[PDB]
Design a binder for these strands. Structure first.
Ligand SMILES: [Cl-]
Ligand SMILES: [Cl-]
Ligand SMILES: [Cl-]
Ligand SMILES: [Mg+2]
Ligand SMILES: [Mg+2]
Ligand SMILES: [Rb+]
Ligand SMILES: [Rb+]
Ligand SMILES: [Rb+]
Ligand SMILES: [Rb+]
Ligand SMILES: [Rb+]
Ligand SMILES: [Rb+]
Length: 136
RNA sequence: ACAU
DNA sequence: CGATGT
């Protein structure tokens, strides 16, 4: 139960669930924001958490970085491990964008390799993840 | 129950 | 209190 400070932390934020979804990744040690996705009009918490991890994998791979990724989402960690986002969200015209991004993230996982450890952020011991959106 |  | 997920 030691934080690995040399890591990337990601989190989703939303207005509603389902609702408007965004996500970001930060340097765990410094809090510096390294990437932020423009808000998506309709998605779920778990789809955003999944996209955040996959974006982190792509970000670190492009920069030849072996740092681990922290996420507080038990669901999204499993989905990334499985390379499959098992979302219940309806696929229709309103949800087309989030589903396109999820499909593309799965596609990336199936066509690329990575060694990045994907670690559970232990909120119960460490407080809220550094990438959190102070919204609850 | 657990994580969000 | 409501939701998404294992
Ligand atoms: Cl994305
Ligand atoms: Cl590690
Ligand atoms: Cl986990
Ligand atoms: Mg989270
Ligand atoms: Mg959060
Ligand atoms: Rb590379
Ligand atoms: Rb929050
Ligand atoms: Rb929060
Ligand atoms: Rb949390
Ligand atoms: Rb809760
Ligand atoms: Rb539940």
């Amino acid at each position: 139960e030691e934080i690995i400070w040399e890591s990337l932390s990601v989190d989703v934020g939303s207005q509603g669930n389902p609702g408007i979804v965004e996500y970001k990744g930060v340097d765990t040690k410094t809090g510096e924001v390294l990437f932020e996705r423009e808000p998506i009009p309709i998605g779920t918490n778990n789809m955003g958490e999944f996209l955040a991890i996959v974006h982190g994998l792509r970000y670190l791979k492009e920069r030849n970085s072996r740092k681990p990724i922290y996420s507080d989402s038990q669901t999204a960690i499993k989905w990334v491990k499985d390379k499959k986002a098992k979302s219940t969200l309806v696929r229709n015209e309103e949800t087309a964008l989030i589903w396109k991004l999820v499909d593309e993230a799965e596609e990336w996982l199936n066509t690329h390799t990575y060694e990045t450890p994907i670690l559970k952020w232990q909120t119960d011991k460490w407080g809220e993840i550094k990438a959190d959106y102070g919204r609850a």
